[PDB]
Design a protein around this ligand. Structure first.
Ligand SMILES: Nc1ncnc2c1ncn2[C@@H]1O[C@H](COP(=O)(O)OP(=O)(O)OP(=O)(O)O)[C@@H](O)[C@H]1O
Ligand code: SF4
Ligand code: SF4
Lengths: 138, 136, 386, 55, 608
């Protein structure tokens, strides 16, 4: 009803939407907080650090801090274990091989917005971004 | 002169060099004032700084209430004795040397001034005007 | 505090037997956090103050009571720590002899006589507070150096108190017949090395702020320049960054006297850099610099600093004497976590005395405040207020 | 130390007074005194007493 | 030890909206953090209340207030000793009161908001003082006790018993037209009814006041000066012992105000007690035997001093400081430019300004005559004289508002004009109106000093002009005339409705801009001091009011002042200390000597 479209912009690790971006936030439009603290008190508590996107919605007298996104994120998703580190473990450089099909099984999902010859382009693409897969596929 | 002295002052004969003692002519408890400095006076090897009518000096109280003795304070010369000369042509003089203890701004410590007061001082220091009887 | 003993029995791996002498009300508060209910203390008083009844009659003595602890009456402002208890009743006669068993008895502590704590629950947190100091509140920040021409005292203030930590001292130059017989310069050179080593070790030389360098004569100034000479030699940037921990003072007397000559006399001190208002003043500046240009990079008050911390924007923490020593105990735990918590997110720390203009400004602000490294807007929301 | 000031008064537990027969004032009270002390007497355990509790 | 101190908080409800702030006052205060009482919320009227007992004096709340609704001050317990009355929580409170004395006239002088008006009511029996407390159901008894140690104690016993019923000449000048019509019907009716005194009194009183023309007119119809005088007539005519006048100089012209002063003084001769409040020092000096000074911040508080002499009280007033109280009541001292002080320039601009020929304007009941004069550029001309002389008419003609019966003045020039009597007739709010005239004038620092910060227009910005006040509106109007660029600016009677500080802000305003901008200005005035500061030349008007009048060409300050003051026959020697005009009595040797010299006033100039 009294609604519109997204904004696609985070900023941060700090939850509660950026931090207090759970509160200015009606200020030309017409919303207030429909996770914009409770599914954002599930934003970074969900995917702590690094950022990803936030796509605040404006759907019905209430925003929506939408913490959708894609790769980078889904890239290091190339793994199977990462027992945290607390803080300051000397960078904890997680880089070491992966599975085969780096591509139509890990970029056919990130295709579309990439341009030109699919694989040759995109499928190739994702590869380089593996700076954290540090050791390349094998 | 200096602070709180609204007005300029035409030169008048210097009557009182450092070391001179004038009568204290207020009701502050001070009996006399011993001049140790003149404000705004200049420098020449061997010259004593010396005050005149309506000059602000720096004095100590040689005779007077002990709460006033043993310290240096500002005073203002109100009567002279060394004769001086005004721009109406007159050479005039008082019977005594005398001034009144005062603050850097120029406020009297006391509330009366006993005896006369020369106009050139009255004209210079308003709170002195206030407390003056016969002027000149 | 002065700890006479402290031993670890063979029959008890855990607890301890501590004989100790509290020296000031900061050391009363230390005792407090060590002593548990059901621990034992043997102290002295002065009981024998009987009936009449058969005989006169009393006797006198100086009778020492082994009391088991049951309760405490603790008043920090009043400099009053008191332990209530029952006699342990040393039926063995070795202790408690001359006291009449079956009768409660109290200990108002004094700074005069030491006492023994037979402890059950001697933990690592108490041990810190017994051998590093125990001001989790921090009042001080000072060290001094008096030198005459022949005697020196390196003095020093505490980790907790106006309580000396280390009375150093060298061979000081004494104005000899010749040009000041070269032994002067080498021996003075030694002292700097001796004082730098002691302060490095004793402290975490990031806890003290002040060295006052005090002399009758040019000695102090000579020594300052000598400090920073040797500083450039070693490329000792712990010293070279920091023209603000040494402050150069003259005095007549220079034994332990000299310090109180320097301080309390308006020659060399006032509210300029003595360095126990140092960074205390500098950060409380910057705190209002930010807060009055409504920038969101300074925040204030027990409610508001804890929230400015939840957002994890804060660097220089502003804490007080008043809100601590005004009356309240417990409360200062909360703020101590809150300093670490905040630093675990960013920052140093400044405790200001409220006995002064600056501490009073911050006290009108609940005695707790911050400067942030970065703006974090609307820290007063989530938590509800202004 | 100031510390203690008023320790005991502030730590004695309140107990409110009780509600009791009003005592007469004046001449009547003297009367009560004279009858209590002299007329129907009371005890004389050994000699006499003017208030014990259990004896 | 340390001296004693207090905290007092006064909050303006007009300025406060708790919704926007939130009850932020409570949240921010450090006392309430602890669990204390300093700020309590009143659920009813929905206002913040600050208790003076619990408040710290921190001032944290003041800064946090978004508007500037709260004010906390720290006093040495100067106010606490004196408490007479208070309007309510966090409102104006009055301190001390003026002594009344029989057979004499006691003056009162102060800046607006001091409680001079309030004080009259208390003495009048109209209002009963609460004593900064509950006192309400007629507790006159308590008031005498509060007054003990003061001479007012006797008066309060008299008032309660109702032996004496004081007659009051109402203060608010704007309010009166609405209240009375006719008095019922026409001023004449009022004077006949009220006349307890002599039949001579009806005629005599009217003659001296120059009421002859005005009798037939109705009260509502009356102009400001006329309106004032009828009230004065009734206060002589009445039979009583105590005659209270509250601001009798308001709206009146220079000649008339002096006349009012003499007549009022006549009461003292019959040994009747008189009390008076004045904004004008010339008037105040003449009337009074004794004078009180009322000081303190406007609308916050105002204390009355101990009774003083006429000469003495005036002298202390001008210093801006009072010793016992030890308060510098006025931030800056008043000074007048010597004329030595002024800048020296060759003036003409384009060779002189415009010039006007002889002019005449005849209504058919009044005739104005004007003598050809010249105006020059970057100059200032004062216009003086009594009202009804056509001072107003002349300015209008130059404005082009009025067409001359004869003569013509068609200038090329752009003119800005400010009218004399200001009554609102503009729809819109204050900010909107001033912004249309010019924004950017609003930006200047000069305008911050004089208008915006003193009054606090920010709060006025939303308010309607109909809803507004008199003096506040006046400063705004003067400023607005200055808002737009013009070769020549015209202002008519800027002193109305303004107290001492307010007028003097205006004096600085006209002189500084004109000098700087190099433009010319004509200012009409009754106030002696204002004319002196601003002007370089003057036009004096003469003739008989409400009949005919005449104007003169501009002439130097010395020349013009002698003519004007010669018409009055009061010399204002000089006081050596204050440099103030000192009035001279009629037939005298010292005053006689001056008449032969031609010196009505003195300044820091050469002269005998
Ligand atoms: N009804 C009221 N409620 C609260 N405060 C009031 C009320 N009437 C007057 N006051 C206060 O008393 C003071 C004002 O009036 P008074 O009428 O006593 O002033 P004055 O001293 O005559 O000043 P002015 O020269 O401005 O007329 C004001 O500053 C105002 O704060
Ligand atoms: S006074 Fe100011 S801060 Fe307090 S409620 Fe009103 S508007 Fe808000
Ligand atoms: S001044 Fe301070 S203490 Fe008083 S009401 Fe305001 S915040 Fe509370």
């Amino acid at each position: 009803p009294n609604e519109v479209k997204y904004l696609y912009l985070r900023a941060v690790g700090g939850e509660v939407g950026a931090s207090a971006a759970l509160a200015p936030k009606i200020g030309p439009l017409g919303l207030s907080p429909k996770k914009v603290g409770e599914d954002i008190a599930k934003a970074t508590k969900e995917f702590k650090g690094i950022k990803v996107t936030v796509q605040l919605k404006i759907q019905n007298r209430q925003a929506a801090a939408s913490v959708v996104p894609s790769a980078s994120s889904l890239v290091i998703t190339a793994l199977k274990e990462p027992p945290r580190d607390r803080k300051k473990d000397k960078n904890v450089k997680h880089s070491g091989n992966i599975q085969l099909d780096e591509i139509i099984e890990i970029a056919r999902q990130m295709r579309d917005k990439s341009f030109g010859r699919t694989l040759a382009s995109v499928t190739k693409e994702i590869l380089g971004t593996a700076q954290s897969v540090g050791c390349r596929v094998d | 002169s200096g602070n709180g002295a609204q007005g300029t002052k035409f030169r008048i004969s210097l009557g009182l060099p450092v070391g001179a003692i004038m009568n204290c002519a207020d009701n502050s408890g001070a009996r006399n004032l011993y001049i140790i400095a003149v404000k705004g006076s200049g420098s020449r090897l061997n010259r004593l700084p010396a005050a005149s009518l309506g000059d602000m000096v720096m004095a100590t109280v040689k005779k007077g209430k002990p709460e006033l003795r043993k310290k240096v304070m500002p005073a203002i010369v109100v009567r002279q004795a060394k004769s001086w000369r005004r721009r109406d042509g007159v050479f005039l003089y008082f019977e005594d040397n005398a001034g009144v203890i005062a603050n850097p701004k120029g406020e009297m410590k006391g509330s009366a001034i006993t005896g006369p007061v020369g106009k050139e001082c009255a004209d210079l220091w308003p709170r002195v005007a206030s407390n003056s009887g016969v002027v000149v | 505090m002065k700890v006479i003993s402290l031993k670890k029995d063979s029959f008890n791996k855990g607890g301890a037997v501590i004989t100790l002498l509290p020296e000031d009300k900061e050391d009363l508060f230390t005792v407090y956090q060590i002593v548990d209910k059901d621990d034992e203390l043997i102290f002295k008083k002065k009981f024998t103050s009987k009936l009449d009844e058969a005989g006169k009659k009393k006797s006198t003595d100086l009778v020492k009571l082994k009391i088991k602890v049951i309760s405490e009456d603790f008043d920090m402002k009043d400099e009053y720590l008191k332990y209530k208890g029952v006699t342990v009743t040393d039926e063995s006669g070795a202790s408690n002899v001359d006291i009449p068993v079956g009768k409660y008895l109290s200990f108002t502590l004094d700074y005069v006589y030491p006492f023994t704590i037979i402890k059950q629950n001697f933990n690592k947190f108490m041990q810190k507070l017994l051998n590093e100091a125990c001001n989790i509140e921090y009042k001080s920040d000072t060290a001094a150096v008096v030198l005459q021409e022949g005697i020196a005292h390196v003095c020093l203030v505490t980790s907790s108190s106006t309580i000396l930590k280390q009375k150093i001292e060298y061979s000081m130059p004494k104005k000899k017949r010749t040009t000041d017989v070269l032994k002067f310069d080498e021996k003075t050179e030694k002292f700097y090395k001796a004082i730098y080593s002691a302060m490095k070790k004793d402290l975490n030389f990031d806890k003290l702020k002040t060295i006052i360098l005090c002399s009758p004569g040019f000695y102090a100034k000579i020594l300052m320049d000598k400090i920073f000479q040797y500083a450039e030699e070693e490329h000792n940037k712990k010293i070279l960054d920091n023209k603000g921990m040494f402050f150069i003072a003259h005095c007549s007397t220079g034994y332990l006297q000299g310090i109180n000559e320097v301080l309390k006399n308006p020659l060399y001190a006032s509210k300029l850099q003595d360095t126990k208002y140092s960074k205390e003043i500098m950060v409380m500046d910057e705190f209002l610099l930010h807060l009055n240009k409504d920038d969101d990079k300074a925040w204030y008050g027990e409610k508001e600093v804890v929230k400015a911390a939840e957002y994890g924007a804060i660097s220089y923490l502003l804490l007080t004497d008043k809100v601590l020593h005004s009356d309240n105990i417990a409360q200062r735990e909360e703020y101590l976590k809150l300093m670490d918590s905040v630093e675990s997110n960013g920052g140093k720390a400044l405790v200001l005395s409220t006995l002064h203009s600056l501490g009073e400004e911050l006290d009108q602000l609940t005695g707790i405040a911050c400067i942030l490294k970065y703006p974090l807007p609307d820290l007063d929301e989530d938590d509800g207020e202004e | 130390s100031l510390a203690r000031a008023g320790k005991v008064k502030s730590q004695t537990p309140k107990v409110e007074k009780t509600e009791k027969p009003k005592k007469p004032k004046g001449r009547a009270y003297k009367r009560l005194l004279y009858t209590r002390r002299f007329v129907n007497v009371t005890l004389v355990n050994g000699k006499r007493r003017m208030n014990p509790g259990p004896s | 030890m340390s001296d004693k101190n207090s905290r007092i908080a006064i909050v303006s409800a007009d300025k406060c909206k708790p919704k926007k702030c939130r009850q932020e006052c409570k949240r921010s205060c450090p006392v309430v953090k602890t669990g204390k009482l300093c700020i309590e919320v009143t659920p009813t009227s929905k206002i913040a209340f600050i208790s003076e007992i619990l408040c710290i004096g921190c001032g944290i709340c003041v800064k946090k207030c978004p508007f500037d609704a709260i004010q906390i001050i720290n006093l040495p317990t100067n106010l606490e000793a004196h408490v007479t009355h208070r309007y309510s929580a966090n409102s104006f409170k009055l301190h001390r009161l003026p002594t009344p004395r029989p057979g004499q006239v006691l003056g009162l002088v102060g800046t607006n908001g001091i409680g001079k008006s309030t004080a009259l009511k208390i003495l009048a029996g109209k209002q009963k003082p609460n004593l900064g407390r509950f006192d309400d159901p007629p507790e006159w008894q308590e008031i005498i006790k509060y007054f003990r140690g003061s001479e007012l104690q006797n008066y309060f016993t008299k008032m309660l018993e109702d032996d004496i019923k004081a007659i009051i000449k109402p203060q608010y000048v704007d309010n009166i037209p609405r209240a009375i019509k006719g008095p019922v019907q026409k001023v004449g009716e009022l004077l006949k009814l009220r006349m307890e005194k002599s039949p001579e009194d009806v005629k005599r009183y009217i003659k001296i006041l120059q009421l002859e023309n005005v009798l037939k007119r109705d009260i509502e119809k009356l102009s400001g000066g006329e309106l004032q005088r009828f009230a004065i007539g009734m206060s002589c005519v009445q039979e009583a012992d105590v005659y209270m006048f509250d601001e009798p100089s308001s709206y009146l012209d220079v000649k008339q105000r002096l006349n009012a002063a003499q007549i009022i003084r006549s009461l003292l001769a019959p040994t009747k007690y008189v009390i008076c409040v004045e904004h004008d020092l010339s008037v105040l000096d003449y009337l009074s035997d004794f004078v009180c000074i009322i000081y303190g911040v406007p609308s916050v508080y105002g204390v009355v001093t101990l009774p003083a002499s006429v000469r003495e009280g005036i002298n202390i007033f001008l210093d801006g400081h009072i010793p016992a109280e030890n308060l510098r009541f006025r931030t800056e001292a008043l000074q007048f430019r010597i004329a030595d002080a002024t800048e020296d320039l060759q003036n003409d601009s384009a060779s002189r300004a415009f010039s006007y020929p002889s002019l005449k304007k005849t209504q058919g009941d009044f005739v104005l005559n004007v003598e050809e004069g010249e105006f020059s550029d970057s100059e200032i001309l004062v216009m003086m004289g009594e009202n009804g002389t056509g001072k107003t008419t002349l300015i209008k003609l130059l404005a082009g508002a009025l067409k001359p019966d004869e003569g013509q003045d068609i200038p090329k020039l752009n003119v800005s004009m400010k009218p004399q009597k200001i009554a609102p007739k503009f729809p819109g709010t204050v900010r909107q109106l001033f912004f249309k005239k010019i924004r950017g004038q609003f930006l200047n620092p000069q305008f911050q000093t004089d208008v915006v910060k003193p009054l606090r227009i920010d709060d006025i910005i939303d308010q309607e002009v109909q809803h507004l006040s008199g003096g506040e509106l006046q400063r705004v109007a003067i400023v607005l005339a200055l808002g737009i660029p013009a070769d020549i600016y015209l202002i008519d009677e800027p002193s109305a409705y303004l107290d001492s500080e307010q007028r003097i802000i205006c004096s600085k305003v006209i002189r500084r801009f004109i000098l700087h901008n190099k433009k010319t200005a004509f200012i009409v005035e009754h106030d002696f001091i204002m004319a002196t500061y601003l002007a370089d030349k003057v036009i004096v008007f003469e003739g008989i009011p409400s009949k005919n009048a005449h104007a003169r060409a501009p002439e130097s300050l010395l020349t013009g002042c002698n003519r004007f003051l010669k018409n009055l026959n009061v010399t204002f020697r000089r006081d050596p200390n204050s440099f103030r005009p000192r009035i001279n009595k009629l037939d005298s040797q010292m005053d006689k000597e001056q008449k032969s010299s031609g010196n009505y006033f003195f300044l820091d100039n050469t002269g005998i």
